[PDB]
Amino acid sequence: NIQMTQSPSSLSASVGDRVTITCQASQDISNYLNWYQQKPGKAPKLLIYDASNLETGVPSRFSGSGSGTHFTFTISRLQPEDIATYYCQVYETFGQGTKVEI
Amino acid sequence: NLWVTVYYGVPVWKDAETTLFCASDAKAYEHNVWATHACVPTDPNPQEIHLENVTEEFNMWKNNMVEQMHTDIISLWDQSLKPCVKLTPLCVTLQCTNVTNNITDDMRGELKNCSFNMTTELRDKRQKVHALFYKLDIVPINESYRLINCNTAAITQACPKVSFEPIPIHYCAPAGFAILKCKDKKFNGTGPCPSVSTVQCTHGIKPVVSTQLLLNGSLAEEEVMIRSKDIRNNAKNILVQFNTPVQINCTRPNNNTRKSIRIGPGQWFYATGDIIGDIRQAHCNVSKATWNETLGKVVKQLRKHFGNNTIIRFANSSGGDLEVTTHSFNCGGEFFYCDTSGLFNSTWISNDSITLPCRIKQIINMWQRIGQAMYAPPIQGVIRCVSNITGLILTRDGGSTDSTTETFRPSGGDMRDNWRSELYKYKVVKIEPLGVAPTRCKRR
Amino acid sequence: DAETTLFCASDAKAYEHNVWATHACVPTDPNPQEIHLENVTEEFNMWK
Amino acid sequence: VFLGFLGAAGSTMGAASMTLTVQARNLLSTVWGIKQLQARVLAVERYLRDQQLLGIWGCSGKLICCTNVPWNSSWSNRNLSEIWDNMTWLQWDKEISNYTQIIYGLLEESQNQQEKNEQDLLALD
Amino acid sequence: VFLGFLGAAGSTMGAASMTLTVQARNLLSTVWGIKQLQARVLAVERYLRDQQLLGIWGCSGKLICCTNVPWNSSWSNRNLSEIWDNMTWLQWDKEISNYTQIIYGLLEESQNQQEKNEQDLLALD
Amino acid sequence: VFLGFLGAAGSTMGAASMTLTVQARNLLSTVWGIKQLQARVLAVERYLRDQQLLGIWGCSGKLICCTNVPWNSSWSNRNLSEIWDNMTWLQWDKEISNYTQIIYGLLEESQNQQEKNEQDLLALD
Amino acid sequence: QVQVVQSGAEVKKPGASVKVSCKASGYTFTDHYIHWVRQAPGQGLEWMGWINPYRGGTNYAQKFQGRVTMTRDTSINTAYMELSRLRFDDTAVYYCARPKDCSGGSCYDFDYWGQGTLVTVSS
Amino acid sequence: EVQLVETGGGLVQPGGSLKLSCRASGYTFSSFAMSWVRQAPGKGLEWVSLINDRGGLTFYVDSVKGRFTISRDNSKNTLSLQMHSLRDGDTAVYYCATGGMSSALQSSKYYFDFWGQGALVTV
Ligand SMILES: *[C@@H]1O[C@H](CO)[C@@H](O[C@@H]2O[C@H](CO)[C@@H](O[C@@H]3O[C@H](CO[C@H]4O[C@H](CO)[C@@H](O)[C@H](O)[C@@H]4O)[C@@H](O)[C@H](O[C@H]4O[C@H](CO)[C@@H](O)[C@H](O[C@H]5O[C@H](CO)[C@@H](O)[C@H](O)[C@@H]5O)[C@@H]4O)[C@@H]3O)[C@H](O)[C@H]2NC(C)=O)[C@H](O)[C@H]1NC(C)=O
Ligand SMILES: *[C@@H]1O[C@H](CO)[C@@H](O[C@@H]2O[C@H](CO)[C@@H](O[C@@H]3O[C@H](CO)[C@@H](O)[C@H](O)[C@@H]3O)[C@H](O)[C@H]2NC(C)=O)[C@H](O)[C@H]1NC(C)=O
Ligand SMILES: *[C@@H]1O[C@H](CO)[C@@H](O[C@@H]2O[C@H](CO)[C@@H](O[C@@H]3O[C@H](CO)[C@@H](O)[C@H](O)[C@@H]3O)[C@H](O)[C@H]2NC(C)=O)[C@H](O)[C@H]1NC(C)=O
Ligand SMILES: *[C@@H]1O[C@H](CO)[C@@H](O[C@@H]2O[C@H](CO)[C@@H](O[C@@H]3O[C@H](CO)[C@@H](O)[C@H](O)[C@@H]3O)[C@H](O)[C@H]2NC(C)=O)[C@H](O)[C@H]1NC(C)=O
Ligand SMILES: *[C@@H]1O[C@H](CO)[C@@H](O[C@@H]2O[C@H](CO)[C@@H](O[C@@H]3O[C@H](CO)[C@@H](O)[C@H](O)[C@@H]3O)[C@H](O)[C@H]2NC(C)=O)[C@H](O)[C@H]1NC(C)=O
Ligand SMILES: *[C@@H]1O[C@H](CO)[C@@H](O[C@@H]2O[C@H](CO)[C@@H](O[C@@H]3O[C@H](CO)[C@@H](O)[C@H](O)[C@@H]3O)[C@H](O)[C@H]2NC(C)=O)[C@H](O)[C@H]1NC(C)=O
Ligand SMILES: *[C@@H]1O[C@H](CO)[C@@H](O[C@@H]2O[C@H](CO)[C@@H](O)[C@H](O)[C@H]2NC(C)=O)[C@H](O)[C@H]1NC(C)=O
Ligand SMILES: *[C@@H]1O[C@H](CO)[C@@H](O[C@@H]2O[C@H](CO)[C@@H](O)[C@H](O)[C@H]2NC(C)=O)[C@H](O)[C@H]1NC(C)=O
Ligand SMILES: *[C@@H]1O[C@H](CO)[C@@H](O[C@@H]2O[C@H](CO)[C@@H](O)[C@H](O)[C@H]2NC(C)=O)[C@H](O)[C@H]1NC(C)=O
Ligand SMILES: *[C@@H]1O[C@H](CO)[C@@H](O[C@@H]2O[C@H](CO)[C@@H](O)[C@H](O)[C@H]2NC(C)=O)[C@H](O)[C@H]1NC(C)=O
Ligand SMILES: *[C@@H]1O[C@H](CO)[C@@H](O[C@@H]2O[C@H](CO)[C@@H](O)[C@H](O)[C@H]2NC(C)=O)[C@H](O)[C@H]1NC(C)=O
Ligand SMILES: *[C@@H]1O[C@H](CO)[C@@H](O[C@@H]2O[C@H](CO)[C@@H](O)[C@H](O)[C@H]2NC(C)=O)[C@H](O)[C@H]1NC(C)=O
Ligand SMILES: *[C@@H]1O[C@H](CO)[C@@H](O)[C@H](O)[C@H]1NC(C)=O
Ligand SMILES: *[C@@H]1O[C@H](CO)[C@@H](O)[C@H](O)[C@H]1NC(C)=O
Ligand SMILES: *[C@@H]1O[C@H](CO)[C@@H](O)[C@H](O)[C@H]1NC(C)=O
Ligand SMILES: *[C@@H]1O[C@H](CO)[C@@H](O)[C@H](O)[C@H]1NC(C)=O
Ligand SMILES: *[C@@H]1O[C@H](CO)[C@@H](O)[C@H](O)[C@H]1NC(C)=O
Ligand SMILES: *[C@@H]1O[C@H](CO)[C@@H](O)[C@H](O)[C@H]1NC(C)=O
Ligand SMILES: *[C@@H]1O[C@H](CO)[C@@H](O)[C@H](O)[C@H]1NC(C)=O
Ligand SMILES: *[C@@H]1O[C@H](CO)[C@@H](O)[C@H](O)[C@H]1NC(C)=O
Ligand SMILES: *[C@@H]1O[C@H](CO)[C@@H](O)[C@H](O)[C@H]1NC(C)=O
């Protein structure tokens, strides 16, 4: 179906800097890409839906922007509550996932 | 130099939602599930004005006319069922045996001869009656039977005089509103339509309740039309509109009786009772060649979206209720559920008749309401039926491990897509007659 | 002074089952506007 | 009645201004009985709101009404030819909808109100 | 209010034309509640249709309105005395109902529309 | 829309006469559905009754309309300063409500009716 | 306040059959789909299927066709998922995701994922 | 390309009558206001009359107000000037010209853009 490539596969960054994760689809998917956060031992939690809108209750430091084939997830500040694996998703397909690290 | 000038009657509109009244010719009868309490007489002169130099954005997937039709049809079903016999004294133990009459091997176990005690016109007297019930209407009380809805819902007999035959209904806008029709013949129901007209009412739309197949609908003018809210999303149904229809021949061969049982002071229960002659399975025939050329056209149009070299597979429904796992419909007054496993069973590589067995049911929850069911009375005689398959509702299989092949299965259940196939070309707009523009004229 | 039928506005948030705001009343007003009528003395009667 | 309704919707604004009466005549005509009655009542009060707007300006009983509000080039800087011979009313509405309320406010702020008061005073001399 | 309502129905048209306000004031005021509401709404929209017809001509807010449509002797060849001093309005309506739509069409075709456009243009010079 | 509604209710009549449009814009917008519909229909026909009263005088589409009815000192013998600079419209209504019907009758008896007939006749010469 | 409760963790055997469930309260059960996604131990998410709670329409991933069967009960607002012919790789945390309102949006953006259910296949 | 040809100029006795005509080509006749301007032989130009684009509004100089009548036919692309009770002061070459005014939906055209040849009237 629609293949996805999510990069970087593993990222290590110190507090304060920005984290930019990129998902590349296999074709035009309009804006129907979602970004989820999964802490270890917990279910994924949706942060970005439709690639730009922010789920209610999410801090504003999480943001997403993209279209067509290319999408980007931006976390402006790596606050200590945020260490988790981040996944992109189009339809049934889930990204390979990236784990931030301190 | 220039001054504000006010114009009234300006031809400007906006997108809006409103309540649309229904026009209908309503000839005949001297007893219609719809045009008796809600709609009004038709228009002798259906006037359509072509709006030249007008390109208008349409969206069949955010059309409020579809939602209005859904609510209207549900409410009209409820209103038609309100003044009829409540069948609450029929939730009793039923002693059932198999039918001793000559029964074909396919129909063995489908029908049960059930004896039970019933109320009479006098409340202090009881009657021993017997009736024929389909096996799909009858649940064993333990591992003595009972109707299927007795645990969950109360049951109301449908009035036999009221007929379930769809009649066309035209959806008309009130004053200050207009209905824009997209006249483009290649339109997939979303985006700009260059050829637009305005109409007083929609075309005659038969409220046909069916699953997996659009019966007695409109036909595409040029080619088979594939429409989907998101063709890449497998969770979204694919509406297929044919350019040439496929005739479907349905029948229940059983010569059936209608026994009247006086259950109350003026209330009657209409049971099946007996069958004159042999007993055979109800079924629907379609032409094998016609179905073949229609499926070839559907594959040709699906490959536009899913690639030219991909293999298009037609498989039967994955699961669900009997309404969605089968072509469920109603013509002749009885409710058919036909196994379409023979319709959808093919693999199309990029390079006689079919008989569908049908099971009848008398206890129906049409719109899955809570605490409400309907008993469909039996029809006297042999019911036959001829319809035009004019489209399909499909669902693509997700999570495909093989990227070369795509699998499409029948779908349905949500009838908002049944009339999205009819209301795709219409759009309600709201006239803004007041405009302001610069002119050289100045008030004294 | 006159008598009329007054419609009821209500925010009606929550639920996805209210004894009142489900058949009779309607949604609220984002901006509740109150205008003070200066130099106005008006006779009131809560008992009528 | 319905003939020609919105037929000049794609015409130029100058050409569509000669057909205002076809679009002005068409603005005035169980639970479903209540639905139809609600639709009819809504149409009536909408028409009356538009007529009230026309009447609080000097435009009562008129489909074309010249005013004393000057045109501001902050609303549109096109010359009459681009407006009345090259554009349609739908495009003009899309272009001018952001200022429509300012224009309406100016129409009822000073011109009709001060005009009326000045005609009150000119009927004294 | 109701006093004198249709009292001049049998009067001459000339004499009944002095009582137009008694017949103009009288055009504006469970399942049976819906019936009464339907009656009231129908009366309202009928009155508004008549006022719209008056307004698309030059006859807004007027019970007697002179126009620029000439009288055609194909509609009636009687002289003013037979009409306004010998006939009643009911007889006149019976005589002229076959042409009423032609007269209405002429009233809104050219006279008010071309007048309005010409007043649009006379407000330039 | 609702801003300033009745804000000049305690102002002088002269000062409250500059705010007539805020109080004129605010006169036009299951069993409880029938209740709301009855309220809306009543408001509509009331507004239309007031507009009909204005129109059978010469005051159609006007919030201030000068007439040809002389003022009688049997209705009020105050000088303009006491009325338009010392009194409010509520006090004036309380003072003049006993004669209001006489004034309305005079407004539609002779002035608008004889005016209209005289304009019918002046359009002959 | 939407709550998505799920059945407890289970231990099965090769060739057995597991029947997970998913109580979902706080919303109209028949308006939103119910998707089933399994996460293997220390691996990425994998989508099993969805069921439409309205009339029980199901879509399965190709590798699970014949083995998985999604069902529902609308009276108690719970979606079931039965996996038969269990194998060792089927050891995973099975989640029932509830997408947002399916009428006017995609049926794939998941607000409420509910708790997981650890199925362990071992001999 | 614009051409305006006048026909009907000639000799007429005092107190007589005369109909001048002007045929137009090369442009949209119905989109232009027309005018008649006369020049006596030894004297300068004098504006006589004006008619709008639709032919509904007619204006005249006060010297010929009750005597002259300007008209037009847009179907035939003709502009007529009827003259009655001709006096000795009307001896002139009459030019039909395009302009004089414009509609409210057009820029101001208070000028005579395209002139005609001329038609000599002698009383
Ligand atoms: C798609 O669209 C198709 C075309 O519309 C539909 O097919 C149509 O289906 C309807 C409903 O079944 C058919 O209507 C029936 O037709 C018969 C009468 O029509 C003709 O039949 C005879 C020859 O066939 C002819 O001699 C007749 O004179 C007549 O011309 C009947 O089967 C039936 O009539 C019954 O209609 C009443 C309402 O159903 C019923 O009350 C009457 O019987 C009852 O009452 C009488 C009197 O009280 C009693 O004597 C009876 O015992 C009984 O109690 C009456 O008999 C009905 O009209 C229609 O013909 C058919 N059209 C075509 C072209 O095939 C499809 O159904 C649509 N598909 C879907 C899925 O909706
Ligand atoms: C369902 O079972 C009922 C019995 O519960 C069947 O009806 C009954 O059938 C018997 C045997 O045919 C009938 O007896 C016969 O009656 C005729 C006269 O009608 C008589 O001539 C014979 O000698 C014999 O007695 C009986 O009357 C009848 N009814 C009852 C109440 O017992 C019914 O036919 C079964 N239906 C099917 C579809 O199998
Ligand atoms: C749908 O298609 C099937 C299959 O063609 C049709 O069944 C056929 O129906 C005909 C006409 O009734 C049968 O012929 C008759 O059969 C019996 C037994 O011999 C007898 O009454 C007559 O002598 C006559 O031959 C035919 O046997 C039967 N064939 C099969 C295989 O069942 C069916 O009628 C079609 N249904 C429609 C159009 O509704
Ligand atoms: C849709 O838009 C087109 C332009 O894209 C409009 O076409 C124009 O139509 C008018 C009226 O028919 C034409 O005027 C005629 O033209 C010729 C000279 O070209 C002349 O013989 C006639 O006197 C007359 O004026 C005009 O030429 C034409 N213009 C084009 C094609 O550029 C059309 O009217 C629009 N239709 C609608 C809104 O219904
Ligand atoms: C019903 O029709 C009759 C005619 O058939 C109308 O009778 C006319 O009534 C007027 C008004 O009362 C009379 O005018 C008066 O007449 C005399 C001179 O005859 C004079 O003293 C007065 O100055 C006044 O003008 C008129 O004569 C009379 N004409 C007849 C009988 O030929 C009557 O008005 C109609 N009634 C209605 C419509 O209510
Ligand atoms: C309520 O009634 C009081 C009187 O009892 C009104 O007070 C008047 O308000 C006006 C407007 O603010 C004042 O005019 C101003 O006055 C001074 C000169 O005194 C000058 O600086 C300004 O040019 C301006 O005209 C006026 O003096 C004042 N009069 C009094 C207190 O006697 C008040 O407006 C009423 N408020 C309402 C109806 O909202
Ligand atoms: C209908 O009611 C009769 C009684 O009127 C039931 O007959 C009884 O059945 C029970 C249970 O087998 C016996 O213990 C009684 O002796 C029977 N009484 C008589 C008078 O025969 C009969 O079972 C009921 N039939 C149904 C539900 O089909
Ligand atoms: C379905 O029924 C229609 C009629 O409703 C059948 O059409 C007839 O078919 C026969 C046999 O070929 C022809 O002789 C007739 O001329 C056809 N028309 C009519 C009006 O009878 C049709 O054959 C049926 N189709 C099947 C069984 O596939
Ligand atoms: C269905 O069964 C009924 C049972 O009566 C049949 O009706 C009879 O038909 C014959 C002709 O075959 C008539 O002579 C009788 O008068 C009818 N009797 C009735 C109505 O009581 C009916 O024909 C059967 N229909 C089929 C097989 O199509
Ligand atoms: C769809 O078709 C399949 C076969 O391709 C059906 O599955 C068979 O169902 C029958 C009847 O229950 C069983 O005896 C077979 O063992 C099943 N085969 C397989 C391979 O599973 C299935 O029932 C059909 N579905 C519908 C809704 O008609
Ligand atoms: C679905 O398609 C298969 C393959 O075409 C059908 O089964 C074959 O039917 C032929 C007779 O036409 C038999 O001789 C073969 O043995 C069957 N092949 C297989 C693989 O089963 C099957 O019956 C179809 N199912 C339907 C029409 O419901
Ligand atoms: C089945 O489809 C055919 C083909 O569309 C229908 O026949 C057409 O009916 C329309 C009705 O307006 C006519 O204009 C066409 O000329 C007909 N076409 C042909 C080829 O005859 C037929 O009515 C449909 N049958 C049902 C039962 O809906
Ligand atoms: C009655 O039918 C059932 C199936 O419904 C079957 O199991 C049973 O054997 C049948 N009994 C007979 C024919 O005696
Ligand atoms: C429908 O057609 C429009 C153009 O009219 C196109 O942009 C859009 O992608 C089409 N939809 C699909 C599902 O192909
Ligand atoms: C189905 O249609 C295809 C179209 O390519 C054709 O090759 C095939 O033979 C058809 N099958 C039957 C059974 O008619
Ligand atoms: C036009 O609008 C601007 C603001 O956009 C305003 O400042 C200016 O005064 C206006 N001009 C006139 C002449 O009203
Ligand atoms: C009107 O202003 C809004 C402010 O958000 C802006 O989005 C929009 O583009 C503007 N429209 C025009 C036609 O200038
Ligand atoms: C009067 O009517 C006739 C047709 O009855 C029509 O031919 C004629 O032109 C009309 N006269 C005028 C002056 O409009
Ligand atoms: C009006 O015309 C109709 C045409 O049928 C005719 O019957 C009728 O007599 C005419 N009426 C008059 C008053 O001429
Ligand atoms: C004023 O009213 C009195 C009765 O109060 C009346 O007699 C008198 O004629 C009226 N004056 C005028 C000028 O109308
Ligand atoms: C109006 O007349 C009535 C007659 O009963 C009287 O009671 C009332 O005081 C009068 N009001 C005024 C303001 O003169």
Numbering used by the authors:
A (entry chain L): 1 to 91, 96 to 106
B (entry chain A): 33 to 62, 66 to 141, 150 to 185, 185A, 190 to 309, 312 to 323, 323A, 324 to 398, ...
C (entry chain C): 47 to 62, 66 to 97
D (entry chain B), E (entry chain F), F (entry chain D): 518 to 546, 569 to 664
G (entry chain H), H (entry chain G): 1 to 52, 52A, 53 to 82, 82A, 82B, 82C, 83 to 100, 100A, ...
What is written in the article reporting this PDB entry?
In a double-blinded, placebo-controlled phase 1 human clinical trial, the recombinant, germline-targeting envelope glycoprotein (Env) trimer BG505 SOSIP.v4.1-GT1.1, adjuvanted with AS01B, induced bnAb precursors of the VRC01-class at a high frequency in the majority of vaccine recipients. These bnAb precursors, that target the CD4 receptor binding site, had undergone somatic hypermutation characteristic of the VRC01-class. The GT strategy for inducing VRC01-class bnAb precursors is rooted in the hypothesis that these antibodies target the CD4bs with a similar angle of approach to VRC01 and use the same conserved contact residues. To verify that VRC01-class mAbs elicited by GT1.1 do not just exhibit similar sequence features to VRC01-class bnAbs but also target the CD4bs in a similar manner and with the same atomic contacts, we selected five mAbs for further structural characterization.
Accordingly, based on the prototypic BG505 SOSIP trimer, we designed GT1.1 to engage bnAb precursors against the trimer apex and the CD4bs, specifically those of the VRC01-class. Finally, GT1.1-induced VRC01-class mAbs are structurally extremely similar to VRC01-class bnAbs. An important hallmark of VRC01-class bnAbs is their ability to accommodate the N276 glycan, which is achieved through specific SHM events as germline variants of VRC01-class bnAbs do not bind to Env with the N276 glycan. When inspecting the GT1.1-bound structures of the three mAbs that did not have measurable affinity for fully glycosylated BG505 SOSIP, we found that these mAbs would clash with the N276 glycan. We conclude that GT1.1 vaccination selects for CDRL1 characteristics that help accommodate the N276 glycan, without the need for the N276 glycan to be present in the vaccine.
